[PDB]
Point group: C4
Chain length 94, copies 4
């Protein structure tokens, strides 16, 4: 019945939204970090986490990481939002 087709579209939508929201959080945290790293205070040490190690990196390396990561996240988020878009439309047609 339509109720079942809708529930399954809703289940898919929730899973996509959950993945998408996790990526936006990480993306926003890195943008916040970029604002601090590029602020006026002269010295701020920065570390990058790799599994269970924290390795010191430079301001330039940190900015590079933030910019590349944002690109990967923006792309993944755009793709997921377009899938959410399609599903919301199907749900609307029902």
């Amino acid at each position: 019945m339509e109720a079942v087709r809708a529930y399954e579209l809703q289940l898919e939508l929730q899973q996509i939204r959950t993945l998408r929201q996790s990526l936006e959080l990480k993306m926003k945290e890195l943008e916040y970090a970029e604002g601090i790293i590029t602020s006026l205070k002269s010295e701020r040490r920065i570390y990058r986490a790799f599994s269970d190690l924290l390795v010191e990196i430079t301001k330039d390396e940190a900015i590079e990481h933030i910019e590349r990561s944002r690109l990967v996240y923006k792309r993944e988020i755009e793709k997921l939002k377009k899938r959410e878009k399609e599903i919301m439309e199907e749900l609307s047609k029902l």
Copy 2:
């Protein structure tokens, strides 16, 4: 049957409690950190985590973060506890 209505209220209550407890933990960890940061020892470096980066911050920045975060958590916790309150009352009326 009442058993089913109760089970569904119980399911909702557990999910709210789980979210609430996660927030109280983070809130209490930051209050503990504040006590240390404002203690007598002269020098303690502090870092703030943003996704996979750790960025050095000052004592004043750390205290600001702790106070703002506590406000956000206290508010979210109060709202969830009020929802738990309502549900516990419904469960009692049944």
Copy 3:
């Protein structure tokens, strides 16, 4: 039927084991850290994590934290292992 009573005891046992194993992991990680902190190398900075902040602590503070945490974990682990013990015995009697 006995199969159902056994499945439910098995479900409970798995959940207890999962909680217990998580605590033993954290406990063992802190014991490993203690071995390093008390080793010969003269200077090793140490930080303690509180939610999203890392705060510098001394060797003595780190050892204190490790010892107290081990006590809390050992106690929680002993209590869970005794519950696992009871269940395994019930499963055996069936």
Copy 4:
């Protein structure tokens, strides 16, 4: 029916794949860290995470940890991939 036997093989395969992928991620993160640690920049502080403590370690200690961890992960990954191999073959024979 074959559909049910296949679903159960698929369920097992997904769980194995999920464990395997988690290990490959950690393994790749440590290999990335090794590349940075052994790069030209003269001074980079390194910390290792043990539960809620971060303890400073040397470049040599970090490399040792990365190499041992890779061995443990490579072995666990090879064993899981061989189990995935078997299941994919069963699924093919059905």
